[PDB]
Amino acid sequence: GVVEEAHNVKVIGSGEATIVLGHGFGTDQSVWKHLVPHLVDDYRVVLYDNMGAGTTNPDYFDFDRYSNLEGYSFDLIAILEDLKIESCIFVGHSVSAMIGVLASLNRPDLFSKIVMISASPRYVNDVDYQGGFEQEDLNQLFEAIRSNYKAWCLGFAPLAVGGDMDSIAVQEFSRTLFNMRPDIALSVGQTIFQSDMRQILPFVTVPCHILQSVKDLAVPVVVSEYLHANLGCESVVEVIPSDGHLPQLSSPDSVIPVILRHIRNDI
């Protein structure tokens, strides 16, 4: 269908047991390349790209629709409905964790579990909340994006990925990041960095597994604690001894076994 094509949907396997994987800003479904091999024997695996990813048609990026994270949640529900999926485990990386959470408020019946990787409900600091960023520094970031997108990508990618700056993962993320149309990257970056999902956390009913690197440029460890304390569902936190915002791509040996444990085992 047109929705599935537009999001580059891939479905691997069949049967009831289903896992759906959603990616974060700057990357695409390829971020899951080290996880998927360990899932396909036990699950029907669904991969898709967020609208606005470099692998998607920019003509389909409706700025009004995606001005709130709910637009992405509607896309996710649409994909699940089109594929006739009545229940899944959802694994959400970065912004996709919150997209899955929002989708679960509208259709909790569609999700049995949410596994979050590098999630945050709020990046901007206030006097009683640490998200990791002051507004002035976000403003500088947006300025840099608009000034020279390629130069910004080259400087940002090693910081986001962490580890050695010359790594394959850094190069890969730099490529997928620059693959986004610059106006879409700027718009999406603003929408995500300015988001606030804190207030809806108490309404979540689907159990959540909260995973992150101990060193993550965009997610202070206190954010995992905040999610755990404020989510209205049963939840569990595991901070991984890894570096980076895309640790399933850049540090799979330490990160993949943790993700698999949380997928396979309930709280």
- Exactly one of 49, 73, 94, 187 is catalytic; which is it? 94
In contact, 140 and 217? CB cutoff 8 Å: no
CA max distance for the chain: 49
Nearest to 161 by CA among 241, 246, 239, 240: 246
Structural contact between residues 260 and 248, judged by C-beta atoms closer than 8 angstroms: no
28, 49, 75, 216: which is the annotated catalytic residue? 216
Residue located via tokens 């001894």: 241
38 in active site: no
Distance (Å, whole) CA 257 – CA 251: 11
Residue 94 a catalytic site member: yes
Report how far residue 213's alpha carbon sits from residue 192's, in angstroms, rounded to the nearest whole number: 19
216 an active-site residue? yes
> Annotated catalytic residue: which of 23, 93, 209, 245?
245
Residues annotated as catalytic are: 94, 216, 245
